[PDB]
Design a protein around this ligand. Structure first.
Ligand SMILES: N[C@@H](CCC(=O)N[C@@H](CS)C(=O)NCC(=O)O)C(=O)O
Ligand SMILES: N[C@@H](CCC(=O)N[C@@H](CS)C(=O)NCC(=O)O)C(=O)O
Lengths: 208, 209
């Protein structure tokens, strides 16, 4: 069915795992240890030399956001029509931009750059608060009336930022309630409480 | 429509979508934002992520360069023939964006001290696109499938700006080299790429390239 090939971290696979779990899908995790990675054969076979790698039947994919968009397209989590699909992309690309900055903080400048990052964070979260504000009072999903792949990515994004800077959502009522509502979904709640999520580090260097 | 492109007077993250629009017979308005106007702050505060490009398609306002490309990709028939092709198109675009991200960081934050090592690492960054071409009809067509996609325009722009940064960087990659020559020769795109329009804008906003 579906196969996720990645290191034993949440990282760039947390959102697509949340998606698969919440949509009732089954998948196989193939965990790559770092000692297997430094051997070099798997990395050499990876299109961009990186993980994650994903299998959907006989279709092999790389890029975390390609995986999300593919699941969105094939499972119907991409909006109701081309205009909503564009808005879904606009949210996901915004999520990706902040994740990229988060990853840079974690791996290359945590100690010295955290203060600084945290101070900039409210300005980085407000666009998502604004998007919720413009969609049914923030009472449903980031775009439209149904969940999309961007909701799962946004949710992961918010969760890891709550760990980095607890209380960071206190200034954003719609985002705070949105985290609460999505996290309470029955399948996602079960997954987020499970050892396969809880006992993985967010990032590869233990920093969070 | 015409569409509207709101951007600084730079090629930057609008080069690919403009090439797409020009090659696909579309009409659009360029609303150029000067430094003076941007720094006044009204427009910026009105942008969803505080940044440009902003794109108008009728009543639909979009931000994010890659959202604009995907929107034009799906509405103009440049996203592959089926769901499989669409996923491969995304995989290419995401790889383009990753390397564009590294290019922009070099240009704006570390150009003088970092350009040397960036060009040294560049063959490793181009090889995946050569590999993708080798697996699609011997590199003789497009990056995905046998019709042009929005990822072709983004990859072409990425390759072109890298040829400015490091001339001859594609000489070691015969399929990418032929691909660039082939796409650049598509007559409407060729006319656009030789136009004032394109030629008279700097690649980046800080004068480095
Ligand atoms: N843009 C890619 C980035 C993938 C990426 O950064 N992978 C890292 C782990 S999160 C990796 O494989 N590092 C090992 C290496 O580059 O050698 C995506 O979203 O999947
Ligand atoms: N991820 C965004 C990045 C947009 C971006 O970086 N915009 C820059 C120009 S390329 C900008 O607006 N700088 C002005 C500012 O941030 O105030 C996209 O792809 O559109």
């Amino acid at each position: 069915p579906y196969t996720v090939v990645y290191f034993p971290v949440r990282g760039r696979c947390a959102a697509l795992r949340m998606l698969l779990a919440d949509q009732g899908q089954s998948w196989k995790e193939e965990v790559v240890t770092v000692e297997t990675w430094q051997e070099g054969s798997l990395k050499a076979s990876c299109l961009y030399g990186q993980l994650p790698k994903f299998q959907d039947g006989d279709l092999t994919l790389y890029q975390s956001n390609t995986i999300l968009r593919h699941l969105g397209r094939t499972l119907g989590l991409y909006g109701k029509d081309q205009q909503e699909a564009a808005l879904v992309d606009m949210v996901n690309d915004g999520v990706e931009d902040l994740r990229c900055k988060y990853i840079s903080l974690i791996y290359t400048n945590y100690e010295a750059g955290k203060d600084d990052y945290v101070k900039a964070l409210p300005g980085q979260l407000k666009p998502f608060e604004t998007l919720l504000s413009q969609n049914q009072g923030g009472k449903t999903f980031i775009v439209g009336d149904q969940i999309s792949f961007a909701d799962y990515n946004l949710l992961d994004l918010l969760l890891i930022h709550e760990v980095l800077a607890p209380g960071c959502l206190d200034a954003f009522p719609l985002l705070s309630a949105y985290v609460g509502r999505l996290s309470a979904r029955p399948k996602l709640k079960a997954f987020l409480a499970s050892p396969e999520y809880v006992n993985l580090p967010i990032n590869g260097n233990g920093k969070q």
